[PDB]
């Protein structure tokens, strides 16, 4: 199985947040670590994406755009899978050193979104999703959000997306399975959008609440994320 060989080969390993677990769970502390973790995971997502079958076919600018637009959804989906496999969706396993219990969920002021992410993590159990299904679905999430006006080379993107859908169907090769996985994929987007809204608001008030953003995450939040919140860049839903 060549395509699956490649996904398994390129899958990022463990990323720590650098969180100081001896300090008390404050909002500013938890946040500052999530932001640092997000940059660390983006560095890995970029190396991953660059190594995916056909990805280098995209215009370079379209490569960078799609990674930035899809980063949140990728991180949520992979986090839900880590949660499932590590702690049976009991808690949110952002990183080995940043595991959220309920108190954290509350302290982070992200409780409603945390609850949605835990529900997603449970879906992985409720659907019996396989490691191979996980890997194809995650590869497809990179190709699931685009400018309503299209990419620089939209034809190349559509052809890649089409082939990743086909790989997901070949890894299912029942039509019930496909309905359910496409539905699970769609459920990522509303969570990512709420996180993007929370993230943008947090960055605007970050000086007031003492939350630290690495420079590159600041730029992404101020340049890319408002395209999504303004409706210029939108998810491709199946349903």
């Amino acid at each position: 199985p060549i395509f699956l060989n490649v996904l398994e080969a390129i899958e990022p390993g463990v990323v720590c947040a650098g969180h100081d677990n001896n300090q008390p769970d404050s909002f500013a502390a938890l946040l500052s670590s999530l932001n640092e973790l997000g940059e660390r995971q983006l560095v890995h997502v970029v190396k991953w994406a660059k190594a995916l079958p056909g990805f280098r076919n995209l215009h370079v600018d379209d490569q960078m755009a799609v990674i930035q637009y899809s980063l949140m959804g990728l991180m949520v989906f992979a986090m839900g899978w880590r949660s499932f496999t590590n702690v049976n969706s009991a808690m949110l396993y952002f990183a080995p050193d940043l595991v959220f219990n309920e108190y954290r969920m509350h302290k982070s002021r992200m409780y409603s979104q945390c609850v949605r992410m835990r529900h997603l993590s449970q879906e992985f159990g409720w659907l019996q999703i396989t490691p191979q299904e996980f890997l194809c679905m995650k590869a497809l999430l990179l190709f699931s959000i685009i400018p309503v006006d299209g990419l620089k080379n939209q034809k190349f993107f559509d052809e890649l997306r089409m082939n990743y859908i086909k790989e997901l169907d070949r890894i299912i090769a029942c039509s019930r399975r496909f309905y359910q996985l496409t539905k699970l994929l769609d459920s990522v987007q509303p969570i990512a959008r709420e996180l993007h809204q929370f993230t943008f608001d947090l960055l605007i008030k970050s000086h007031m609440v003492s939350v630290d953003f690495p420079e590159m995450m600041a730029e992404i939040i101020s340049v890319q994320v408002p395209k999504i919140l303004s409706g210029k860049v939108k998810p491709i839903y199946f349903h």
């Binding site: 370079v60 960078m64 930035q68 730029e219 992404i220």
Partner: peptide
Amino acid sequence: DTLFSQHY
């Protein structure tokens, strides 16, 4: 230009 494009 952009910090991301320079990372990329």
